[PDB]
What does this fold into?
Amino acid sequence: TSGWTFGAGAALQIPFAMQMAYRFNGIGVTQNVLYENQKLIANQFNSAI
Amino acid sequence: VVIGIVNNTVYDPLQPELDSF
Amino acid sequence: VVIGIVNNTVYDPLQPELDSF
Ligand SMILES: *[C@@H]1O[C@H](CO)[C@@H](O[C@@H]2O[C@H](CO)[C@@H](O)[C@H](O)[C@H]2NC(C)=O)[C@H](O)[C@H]1NC(C)=O
Ligand SMILES: *[C@@H]1O[C@H](CO)[C@@H](O[C@@H]2O[C@H](CO)[C@@H](O)[C@H](O)[C@H]2NC(C)=O)[C@H](O)[C@H]1NC(C)=O
Ligand SMILES: *[C@@H]1O[C@H](CO)[C@@H](O[C@@H]2O[C@H](CO)[C@@H](O)[C@H](O)[C@H]2NC(C)=O)[C@H](O)[C@H]1NC(C)=O
Ligand SMILES: *[C@@H]1O[C@H](CO)[C@@H](O)[C@H](O)[C@H]1NC(C)=O
Ligand SMILES: *[C@@H]1O[C@H](CO)[C@@H](O)[C@H](O)[C@H]1NC(C)=O
It folds into this structure.
């Protein structure tokens, strides 16, 4: 629900699609790569779980 | 392709200069 | 100075607008 923010302080809510887009920026992949492939990325995650 | 995109203007700071010229 | 540099065009978004003005 809130990214890393509940670690540093208050839980700042953010949409999970946009949290994951932050996660992509962290690994040096531009966030449009998430948003343009979000359905594939979700399907890969659900299968891996 | 983007889920949940929203419509708005995006400002273009070259244009008013070139227009004023 | 650069080892292995290659020749290519580099585009410029100001240039065609200035040319249109
Ligand atoms: C990137 O790889 C994924 C697989 O992980 C490809 O997704 C598959 O695409 C085919 C159609 O070509 C579908 O039938 C599969 O169901 C897709 N898999 C999943 C998990 O959705 C994807 O096409 C690949 N993209 C590129 C550009 O190579
Ligand atoms: C964002 O703006 C576009 C137009 O620039 C909207 O697209 C229109 O959507 C209606 C349906 O609601 C269609 O009948 C039109 O043909 C579309 N026009 C074009 C040019 O595609 C779009 O709906 C807007 N987004 C939202 C969320 O309202
Ligand atoms: C890339 O372009 C430059 C010119 O912009 C070329 O440089 C010349 O190269 C010759 C040797 O082939 C020299 O004698 C000249 O003095 C160079 N001129 C300048 C202005 O540097 C270069 O050859 C080109 N390289 C490729 C691979 O196309
Ligand atoms: C958010 O969820 C509502 C349903 O609760 C849905 O109608 C809406 O399209 C969703 N918006 C986005 C951006 O996902
Ligand atoms: C790669 O090797 C060639 C020799 O075959 C050399 O002329 C060239 O400068 C080299 N380029 C780089 C980037 O090391």
